[PDB]
Design a protein around this ligand. Structure first.
Ligand SMILES: [Zn+2]
Ligand SMILES: [Zn+2]
Lengths: 729, 135, 708
């Protein structure tokens, strides 16, 4: 802790060696003990401005980052016959209600006092739990719970075959067939497409699955009323048989073209009377039919920041898909520009999620093969909800005015999410429409109305309570630097589509500049408060991410996927991608998270992202959230190389070392343990590379050292001075 | 030739099992939900109701209502030949538990059996009244 | 005798002229009552017949170019022959320098007046069969098509290409042979396609059309587990049957793939076309398929356009060179009145049955592949009929399975009869039974040459030449010597086709009668205003009786049949030889009883003898009757007894006497067994008998002698 000031120039080691923790809002003990999981709901400002004004001169942005479907340990689920909520605002009974009569409760959002219907009422579960799940009654659904419908759509073009992904996808689909979420109603489909759209029937009536082509690309339809979307249970061996088949159907196609548009318009029609999850797999620019996407040309490092989609089609289709509870997930596996700027708009507006495997090849690039493999195991076994809808309620005087994530904002600001991803993030900007005079406490709550694999309507409600402060300095004291950088990123991505990449990169500096220029005028060098002692560092990391960097050889589909992941990944994983956690893993000692009965697991200090913290006589590991990496020292100790690498000298390491052998030395079990602990702090299984040597063609590890200078960007010290000089103009 | 089946509890009206399929269902599944509420211990044990282009067809047994809705025309005395095979399987498999449950659609997995019996009725190979009266 | 002369010339040349002595004058030419015609059967069988494995000789006159024949004059001394059509003198070819008097070329011997040349040149093209299957039928009626479709392939030659299309609401062009996937392209059963379109939408063997010998194992299993149109059929409604598209896709499929060789488009419908272009009736049973009455009272709006679409599929398929057959088997009318321009213009078949599970239909189908004595199919593909004439004779038209090649020449008549305006036609499919009718006009002897070049079912290109000669009519004794050559039988079936063609393509009987009378007045004997005298010669006598039957026939008296029934009946008439044609117009009746053996009897209710057992042979049905007292001692269980063993031969002589042609005639006819009061004897009294014959003859005689 500490109200203290910080001079970012003199210290320069400002980052903790321990992982950073959320800030605890300055809130009464008995209230804070009920506040919900900060990794499920968290404001940029724990301490809430009272006047739009006051907010306006911290030049910090008021907003919320939520992660509503996070897989929980303990989730209380109340089957209350009747559900008690606000008789106006329609808010759910938060524990941050003020009870007054034991017969009346004081709504903490729109200030109306309600009667608790004949149903120690203060310690009922709806009030002892901030993260609760309700069992919605009959009035909360337009139709009976939909069955789970997972249709899969493959590209099988010439390029598609050369990549060879259809072999891994189909073995994944086989190995997780019983693990697909649903009960005996789980429906499943299959579609492939080159210049033509291919349906597959499945009846136990003939021996073979039937392949039904549609060739009217300018007018598509369905060729069979049944057996195209089959019950998995009874038709399992017929689905299995097809998956051992499909990878072998095209091994000699000379189709260069891909009618994505048509394929998809059909794929939507197929499931449109139920909705479900359309899993779409794609490998090249779509050049045939509607969705025609002219080729473009990648910008080299010599270009100036000078982003948008090419056609409305991919968006308008995603709206239709939404309107029918259809969600589209874009698995891009391309090796050339595919106009993901246009393609992504399929998962953006339909509660989807995008997956990018640049230059996929089942030989020439075994990294992605092991990534795609793992990521799919997640995409296939992870809990799923259907025909979901979400509303975010904040207390009177605040107003939500802007939404970030994968969904469609319908009238009355209803986040229509056709499907709820358990690893998808969402974010929101609020503002003070009416000043917070009468209130010392504001609360936010979001409700997730969804349908579970087991066909039961549920509502997930998280509630959050925060103080209201009235001075500049008490606004800064509970600023949330991570949550601010996250909100700023989602904010800047629109900025770069609304305007220009330079204008994106601009507010991002001006977010620091305009903020500390306003705090210095609220009290020699660069003064910040403790809570913002990392705001200039992370924002640098922002500017240096693949999404925002300039002077680099970055390609369009990469940076677009980089932004796509900003708007859709939760906070913790955006942080990890931006500012990876780097570890001294040559000498693992023992001041570490042992306890866990028989394990080791040191917590070597989280190292600052610089070269000068490296050392060529060791071997360092870099957590990028979605992947791990291990730099190895040219001049390193052999002891390492011979006991955890099992290699006599650093010259004899296989270049794509997929993962460490499980050797037999306390030094091996070590860096296995510390990696495994790193793997179980996420459900996403991250791949690990030793590949870093000194020239093994993989020196991106070096672009994450986001404190060092380049032929293209400042250094952190360099960045600190551009700030100060502009703080003091 | 075109359907809309619903099974609900005659008491509260809690729906138990349905079958729907499209390629409208909005207004038409309403009245069924409001019919379900009305039905009590005097309601006719079998009754046919009538509505412009469509028609309702329900029995009541063991305290559970087996309603089906069809676009007029469709064979009257055949409709009840479905719900007899339905009520067979419901009272057979789930009859015991119907007054114990309370989550809506607690027997949704019964959708899987409605459909194979629903269709084995579309390809060829009692009291009368008007819907707007009871409601 | 001119009788033998009729029957020797049909036997040899496959020809039957109305007159075998033609008018020597524009005087009697223009006054020729029944016109100058022949029924030309271009592939009539020949026992001791040797194909001629050499190119046929031709005339070195650029415009003529007729084939060396037993008419042309030779010069075995000076190697020179003089064409009989244009009088050119032609060098003999190399092979023909060793000719002799004794050892003269086959082509010139009067035996080979008809001859068959085998122009073995191009590498032979494989045959093609396209199955076009309807899946909108019951399981019993569809299962028995898969079996009966599957039989066909045990009969088809190794090298021939096969293709399958199922259809119902959609149409499925099957890509064959694929393993563990069995694919099919799918098309809206409601948008017609260009041949280009369907080429682009899809792409010697095709994916779709493949040699049977290398997919006969994967095509059978497809048919083996072919199943009904998956779309369900709502109560009160017919299925949705897209025949219009599903035919024009089979048409367009073959169009972009193997234009201009023998191929059979074989379509099987189990009910009418209820969707798409070329629709026939709607999806509601409440309104039922149009009747003739409906069509005359303008209550059928689905036939005027339906007729158009199919008619254009006929021309587009007959121009390409493919044959469209139609096998409709269903209780209700199946839409053969709009679809008949297909099998009719191309050479294709038309087959009608109650349900495909009849033993009638299934045999009527293996008869489509009956081979000759060599194990080779009797059917042929892509015939090109070319007729050459002496400088006097012009060609009014052809009535029959054929299409114009609209080729012009000084031998084409300014009077167009039916398919007139050409001396070249293209029969798109033909068998040794096919019979055109060619109609000529006059403008020493006369000669006509028939040149048909067709694809043999052994893939060999073959040309058939029949050159005929009939004498001109001495002007001293003109009309007296013409009435001799008259072929009462041929002339009536020749006039009969003139009739049908005007009816099918709209009085009629007014023109038919005026030529009966005109005829009576010109060639029989009488005194004016006196009916009693009027006798015809032996030569003419039959002509009125046949006319009596033609005018009451099913072919002209459309009502009491369905439009399909009428289109069907007319179909076979316009393709059958004289012999079978007469059976059609006047059924052939036989006799069986205790008194007298098998002996034909006059179709009249003077022959409906209770005492007797008959046998009426309509070409289309084979009846057998039991009288009052012949039905009674069969209901008597007396047949059983072994004292009266004469009973048995009596009630199993016509059975055998019928099974003999019950397995010969192409469309195997309905078999019947009825008696007085039987439900189907109604046909016996509807063909037994203005009015009846007797009365009919007199109205004719009384007008035969009155005003010219
Ligand atoms: Zn409220
Ligand atoms: Zn000549």
């Amino acid at each position: 802790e500490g109200l203290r000031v910080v001079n970012l120039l003199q210290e320069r080691n400002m980052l903790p060696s321990t992982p950073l923790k959320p800030p605890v809002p300055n809130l009464h003990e008995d209230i804070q003990k009920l506040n919900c999981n900060p990794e499920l709901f968290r404001c940029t400002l724990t301490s809430i401005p009272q006047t739009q004004a006051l907010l306006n001169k911290a030049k910090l942005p008021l907003g919320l980052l939520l992660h509503p479907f996070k897989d929980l340990v303990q989730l209380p689920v109340v089957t209350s016959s009747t559900i008690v909520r606000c008789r106006s605002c329609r808010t759910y009974i938060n524990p941050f209600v003020s009870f007054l009569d034991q017969r009346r409760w004081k709504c903490n959002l729109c200030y109306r006092v309600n009667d608790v219907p004949e149903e120690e009422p203060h310690r009922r579960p709806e009030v002892q739990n901030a993260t609760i799940e309700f069992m919605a009654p009959s009035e909360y659904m337009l139709r009976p719970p939909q069955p789970p419908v997972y249709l899969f759509v493959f590209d099988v073009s010439h390029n598609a075959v050369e990549t060879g992904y259809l072999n891994s996808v189909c073995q994944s689909l086989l190995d997780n067939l019983d693990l697909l979420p649903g009960n005996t109603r789980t429906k499943i489909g299959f579609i492939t497409f080159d210049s033509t759209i291919h349906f597959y029937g499945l009846q136990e009536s003939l021996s073979q699955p039937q392949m039904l082509i549609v060739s009217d690309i300018e007018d598509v339809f369905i060729p069979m009323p049944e057996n195209l979307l089959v019950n998995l249970n009874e038709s399992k061996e017929l689905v299995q048989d097809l998956l051992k088949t499909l990878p072998q159907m095209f091994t000699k196609t000379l189709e260069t073209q891909s009618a994505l548009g048509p394929a998809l318009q059909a794929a939507f029609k197929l499931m449109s009377p139920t909705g479900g999850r359309m899993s779409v797999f794609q490998t090249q620019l779509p050049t045939l039919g509607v969705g025609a996407l002219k080729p473009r040309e990648e910008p080299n490092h010599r270009s100036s920041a000078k982003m948008t989609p090419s056609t409305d089609f991919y968006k308008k289709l995603a709206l239709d898909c939404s309107g029918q509870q259809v969600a589209v997930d874009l698995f891009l596996l391309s090796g050339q520009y595919s106009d993901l700027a246009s393609l992504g708009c399929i998962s953006r507006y339909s509660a989807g999620s995008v997956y990018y495997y640049p230059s996929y090849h089942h030989q020439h690039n075994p990294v992605q093969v092991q990534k795609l493999q793992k990521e799919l195991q997640r995409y296939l076994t992870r809990k799923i909800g259907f025909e979901a809808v979400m509303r975010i309620r904040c207390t009177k005087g605040l107003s939500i005015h802007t939404f970030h994530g994968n969904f469609f904002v319908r009238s009355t600001d209803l986040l229509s999410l056709p499907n709820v991803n358990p690893d998808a993030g969402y974010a929101v900007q609020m503002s003070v429409e009416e000043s917070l005079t009468d209130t010392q406490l504001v609360s936010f709550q979001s409700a997730l109305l969804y349908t579970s694999s087991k066909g039961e309507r549920r509502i997930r409600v998280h509630t959050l309570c925060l103080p209201v402060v009235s001075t500049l300095n008490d606004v800064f004291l509970g600023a949330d630097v991570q949550a601010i950088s996250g909100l700023l990123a989602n904010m800047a991505v629109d900025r770069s589509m609304t305007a220009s990449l330079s204008d994106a990169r601009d507010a991002l500096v001006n977010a620091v500049i305009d903020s500390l220029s306003a705090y210095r005028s609220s009290v020699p060098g660069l003064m910040v408060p403790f809570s913002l002692r990392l705001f200039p560092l992370f924002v640098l990391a922002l500017l240096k991410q693949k999404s925002f960097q300039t002077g680099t050889n970055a390609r369009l589909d990469e940076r677009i996927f980089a932004m796509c992941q900003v708007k859709n990944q939760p906070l913790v994983y955006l942080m990890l991608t931006t500012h990876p956690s780097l570890y001294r893993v040559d000498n693992l000692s023992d001041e570490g998270a042992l306890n866990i009965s028989d394990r080791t697991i040191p917590q070597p200090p989280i190292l600052q992202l610089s070269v000068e913290k490296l050392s060529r006589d060791g071997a360092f590991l870099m957590d990028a959230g979605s992947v791990l990496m291990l730099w190895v020292g040219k001049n390193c100790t052999q002891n390492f190389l011979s006991q955890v690498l099992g290699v006599q000298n650093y010259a004899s390491i296989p270049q794509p070392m997929t993962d460490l052998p499980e050797l037999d030395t306390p030094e091996s079990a070590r860096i296995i343990a510390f990696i495994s602990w790193l793997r179980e702090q996420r459900p996403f299984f991250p791949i690990l590379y030793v590949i870093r040597d000194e020239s093994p063609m993989k020196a991106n590890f070096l672009q994450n050292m986001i404190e060092d200078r380049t032929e293209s960007a400042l250094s952190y010290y360099e960045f600190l001075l551009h700030i100060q000089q502009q703080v003091n103009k | 030739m075109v359907l809309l089946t619903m099974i609900a509890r005659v008491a509260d009206g809690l729906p138990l099992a349905a079958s729907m399929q499209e390629d409208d269902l909005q207004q038409y599944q309403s009245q069924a939900k409001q019919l379900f509420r009305k039905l009590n211990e005097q309601s006719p044990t079998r009754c046919t109701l009538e509505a412009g282009a469509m028609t309702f067809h329900y029995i009541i047994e063991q305290g559970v209502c087996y309603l089906v809705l069809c676009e007029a025309a469709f064979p009257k005395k055949l409709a009840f030949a479905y719900l007899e095979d339905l009520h067979s399987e419901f009272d057979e498999q789930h009859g015991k538990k119907v007054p114990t449950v309370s989550r809506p659609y607690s027997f949704i997995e019964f959708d899987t059996f409605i459909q194979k019996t629903k269709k084995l009725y579309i390809d060829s190979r009692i009291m009368v009244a008007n819907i707007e009266e009871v409601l | 005798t001119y009788l033998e002369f009729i029957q020797q010339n049909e036997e040899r040349d496959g020809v039957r002229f109305s007159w075998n002595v033609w008018p020597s004058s524009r005087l009697e030419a223009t006054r020729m009552v029944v016109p100058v015609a022949a029924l030309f059967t271009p592939l009539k069988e020949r026992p001791d017949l040797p194909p001629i494995q050499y190119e046929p000789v031709l005339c070195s006159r650029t415009t003529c170019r007729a084939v060396l024949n037993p008419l042309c004059q030779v010069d075995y001394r000076a190697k020179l022959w003089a064409c009989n059509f244009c009088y050119q003198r032609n060098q003999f070819p190399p092979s023909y320098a060793g000719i002799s008097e004794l050892n003269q070329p086959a082509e010139l011997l009067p035996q080979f007046s008809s001859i068959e040349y085998v122009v073995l040149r191009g590498p032979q093209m494989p045959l093609i069969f396209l199955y076009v299957v309807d899946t909108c039928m019951e399981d019993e009626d569809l299962q028995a098509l898969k079996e009966s479709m599957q039989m066909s392939l045990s009969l088809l030659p190794p090298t021939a290409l096969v293709g399958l299309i199922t259809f119902g609401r959609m149409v499925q062009v099957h890509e064959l042979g694929c393993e563990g996937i069995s694919k099919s392209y799918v098309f809206r059963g409601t948008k017609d396609l260009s041949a280009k379109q369907l080429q682009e939408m899809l792409g010697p063997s095709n994916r779709f059309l493949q040699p049977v010998q290398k997919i006969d194992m994967n095509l059978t299993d497809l048919l083996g587990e072919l199943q009904r149109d998956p779309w369900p059929v709502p109560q009160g409604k017919r299925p949705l049957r897209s025949s219009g598209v599903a035919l024009s896709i089979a048409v367009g499929l073959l169009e972009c793939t193997f234009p201009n060789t023998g191929a059979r488009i074989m379509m099987f419908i189990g009910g009418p076309a209820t969707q798409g272009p070329g629709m026939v009736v709607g999806d509601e049973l409440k309104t039922p398929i149009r009747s003739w009455h409906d069509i005359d009272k303008d209550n059928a709006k689905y036939v005027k356009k339906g007729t158009k679409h199919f008619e254009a599929l006929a021309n587009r398929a007959a121009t390409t060179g493919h044959v469209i057959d139609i096998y409709a088997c269903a209780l209700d009318q199946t839409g053969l009145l709009e679809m008949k321009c297909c099998p009719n213009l191309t050479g294709g078949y038309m087959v009608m049955g109650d349900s495909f599970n009849t033993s009638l239909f299934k045999q009527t189908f293996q008869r489509v592949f009956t081979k000759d004595m060599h194990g080779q199919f009797k059917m042929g593909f892509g015939g090109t009929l070319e007729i050459k004439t002496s400088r006097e004779i012009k060609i009014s038209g052809a009535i029959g399975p054929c299409v114009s090649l609209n080729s012009k020449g000084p031998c084409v008549s300014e009077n167009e009869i039916g398919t007139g305006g050409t001396c070249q036609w293209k029969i798109c499919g033909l068998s040794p039974t096919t019979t055109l009718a060619i109609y000529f006009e006059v403008v020493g002897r006369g000669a006509i040459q028939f040149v048909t070049q067709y694809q043999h079912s052994s893939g060999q290109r073959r040309i058939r030449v029949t050159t005929i000669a009939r004498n001109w009519a001495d002007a001293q004794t003109q009309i007296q010597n013409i009435a001799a050559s008259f072929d009462q039988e041929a002339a009536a079936i020749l006039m009969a086709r003139l009739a049908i063609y005007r009816a099918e393509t709209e009085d009629v009987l007014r023109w038919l009668d005026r030529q009966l009378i005109r005829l009576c007045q010109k060639f029989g004997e009488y005194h004016k205003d006196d009916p009693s005298s009027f006798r015809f010669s032996e030569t003419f006598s039959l002509y009125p009786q046949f006319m009596f039957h033609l005018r009451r026939s099913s072919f002209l008296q459309v009502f009491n049949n369905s439009p399909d029934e009428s289109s069907y009946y007319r179909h076979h008439f316009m393709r059958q030889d004289l012999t079978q044609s007469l059976i059609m117009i006047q059924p052939i009746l036989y006799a069986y009883s205790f008194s007298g053996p098998p002996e034909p009897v006059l179709l009249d209710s003077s022959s409906i003898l209770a005492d007797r057992i008959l046998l009426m042979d309509t070409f289309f049905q084979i009846l057998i009757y039991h009288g009052e007292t012949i039905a009674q001692w069969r209901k008597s269980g007396y047949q059983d007894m072994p004292e009266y063993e004469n009973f048995r031969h009596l009630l199993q002589a016509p059975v055998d006497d019928a099974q003999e042609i019950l397995h010969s005639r192409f469309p195997m006819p309905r078999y019947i067994d009825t008696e007085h009061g039987g439900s189907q004897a109604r046909f016996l009294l509807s063909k037994v008998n203005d009015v009846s014959l007797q009365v009919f003859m007199d109205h004719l005689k009384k007008l035969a002698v009155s005003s010219a």
